[PDB]
């Protein structure tokens, strides 16, 4: 059985970045080179591996993380980066081993008048740990006075919608992102090039 990859890349609904979706890829024929020439990708960059030299490797598990961000935030889905997405939404480790794949989805994810379904976290008391997920909706206390569950002075709703529109500039258009992390554990390898 070939690795269910079209299920991730061709999923109808994609997660909001703050609530990024994980799919675990199990024991299957991992064919990596065909993927790299499966569609026109605006981003295909790998970290400690090649698109062709992966077809001679074995791993315990592959994790496929998927979400939507705007074009000018794709740069943030890389080791060592900063910004709202890397700090408070989706963090890659320093020693990351995987690929980051992205494509423009303005044909799909943009609605006229705005698609307000996609959220990102604007405020957090501290940066996320690598592969951390925060789905909390606590009002963000920037002040000394407590927020009683209601936004106000010094009390900020922590999430914001992108509001993707078709006429938006390239940097502001929605981009679908798939992140493939490659794992090794003290257990038999399951996914192989």
């Amino acid at each position, epitope marked *: 059985n070939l690795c269910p990859f079209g299920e991730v890349f061709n999923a109808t609904r994609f997660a909001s970045v703050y609530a990024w979706n994980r799919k675990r890829i199990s024991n299957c024929v991992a064919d990596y080179s065909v993927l790299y020439n499966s569609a026109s990708f605006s981003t295909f960059k790998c970290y400690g591996v090649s698109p062709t030299k992966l077809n001679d490797l074995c791993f315990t598990n592959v994790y496929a993380d998927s979400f939507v961000i705007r074009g000018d935030e794709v740069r943030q889905i890389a080791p060592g980066q900063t910004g709202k997405i890397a700090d408070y939404n989706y963090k890659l480790p320093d020693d990351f081993t995987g690929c980051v794949i992205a494509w423009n989805s303005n044909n799909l994810d943009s609605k006229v008048g705005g698609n307000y*379904n996609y*959220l990102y976290r604007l405020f957090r008391k501290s940066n996320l740990k690598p592969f951390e997920r925060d789905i909390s909706t606590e009002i963000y206390q920037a002040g000394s006075t407590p927020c009683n569950g209601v936004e106000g002075f010094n009390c900020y709703f922590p999430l914001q919608s992108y509001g993707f529109q078709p006429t938006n500039g390239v940097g502001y258009q929605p981009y679908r992102v798939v992140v493939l992390s490659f794992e090794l554990l003290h257990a038999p390898a399951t996914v192989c090039g």
Partner: antibody
Amino acid sequence: QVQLVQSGAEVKKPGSSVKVSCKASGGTFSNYAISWVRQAPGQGLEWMGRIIPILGIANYAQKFQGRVTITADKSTSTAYMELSSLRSEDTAVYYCARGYYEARHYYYYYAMDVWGQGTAVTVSS
Amino acid sequence: DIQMTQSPSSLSASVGDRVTITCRASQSISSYLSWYQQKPGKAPKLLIYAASSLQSGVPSRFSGSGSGTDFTLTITSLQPEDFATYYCQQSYSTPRTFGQGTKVEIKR
């Protein structure tokens, strides 16, 4: 030209509950908070609470906590205010109003820009 | 809870007048201050937000100012359509309390 259309007038006995609807029309508002404000006859305005429809997050003034529930159906773009253990003092016109909550629209400071037409609720035996 | 006290409770004015309504907060509220108009049997309508910003489509005879606790709504060249009740509302913190209102009546 987004309007907010509320359900009709209601008469209710003491101790019962009322549920009032608020429907977005000429739009499907998803960027906005929905507040509920009430006005007793001859009296001022009183903020009851708000819902953030997108995530179904609702919070209420201390005064109404325990008795009030605000919900939103995302598909219909309908918000609901249910008030329970009704008392004659709950006789009022109830307003829904659309306002802001997001940092992008900070410069409104949560002002309520579009109001429903109101719902007269009469509580009496 | 922040208390909002409006004054005067009501005032009488003639078409053409310049009218001032004040709202005092129990503490400093920055610009978390809005002004609303209400006519008998009708929903309130937003005039001013952020203390000073004129709401889109509202006549420019309405304006707001204020600093700290003290806020004012001014109607410069009062027209018949402007006789109404006016409410301030703070949105600084829960609950988002309103002033008790100011009725602008016709002088005779």
